[PDB]
């Protein structure tokens, strides 16, 4: 899990926020691995990743990367999408599979938090006061 | 001090060169609105940034 990075465990505030241990990161370790691969190779695009092993202290994933400027990718349709600018650093905006799993997206009654495309989008729509011209 | 770097000396040179009164023919221009150099700096009153 994610230990809260506060000096000497002091989280100055109300007791409900005193937690330091037993805390958890919102994104998965696979998403973190994809993010590290993408940050190292910012000239490539993270496509997906998979699990290849684990230990008591380590997890091992293999991340598929695509060189967006190689001709074998540029000249092939159905892979030209990854070369568009709207797809750079998908793993840092949670657009891969592993990253998307943590956003609460989906269809139906279990996923009402994300109607509108994201939790923040749903929150804005539900917390905006629509002040029409004629009230 | 006497010991100074080239950058410091050049900065002081620019601040020296811009510490002069306005030319008198400026006030004869059309729609001037300028009377005297308000950015004058005296060495004893206002100290430079560096």
């Amino acid at each position: 899990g994610r230990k809260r990075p506060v000096p000497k465990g002091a989280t100055y505030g109300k007791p409900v926020h005193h937690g330091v241990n037993q805390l958890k990161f919102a994104r998965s370790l696979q998403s973190v691995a994809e993010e590290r691969a993408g940050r190292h190779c910012g000239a490539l695009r993270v496509l997906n990743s998979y699990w290849v092993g684990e230990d008591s202290t380590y997890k091992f994933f293999e991340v598929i990367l695509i060189d967006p400027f190689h001709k074998a990718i540029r000249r092939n349709p159905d892979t030209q999408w990854i070369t568009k600018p709207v797809h750079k650093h998908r793993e840092m905006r949670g657009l891969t599979s592993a990253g998307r799993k943590s956003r609460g997206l989906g269809k139906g009654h279990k996923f009402h938090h994300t109607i509108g495309g994201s939790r923040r989008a749903a929150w804005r729509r539900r917390n905006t006061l629509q002040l029409h011209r004629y009230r | 001090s006497s010991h100074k770097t080239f950058r410091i000396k050049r900065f002081l040179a620019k601040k020296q060169k811009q510490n002069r009164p306005i030319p008198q023919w400026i006030r004869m221009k059309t729609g001037n609105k300028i009377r005297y150099n308000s950015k004058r700096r005296h060495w004893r009153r206002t100290k430079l940034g560096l």
Binding site: - | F6, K9, L12, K14
Partner: protein, 60 residues
């Protein structure tokens, strides 16, 4: 006495003076003025008269 480019060294000043005035110089002393311009004192070779050179340049 010349006002030269602040980025020019003594070798460059010597060669420039030699080429564009057709004179031979002995040594170049160099300072940078408090206003930022570089000043070069170019001593001429003994067989050249700096007075005559200044007359030809037109700075008498």
């Amino acid at each position: 006495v010349f006002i030269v480019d602040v980025k020019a060294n003594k070798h460059q000043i010597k060669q420039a003076v030699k080429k564009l005035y057709d004179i031979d110089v002995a040594k170049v002393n160099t300072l940078i003025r408090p206003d930022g311009e570089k000043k070069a004192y170019v001593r001429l070779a003994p067989d050249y008269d700096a007075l005559d050179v200044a007359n030809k340049i037109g700075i008498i």
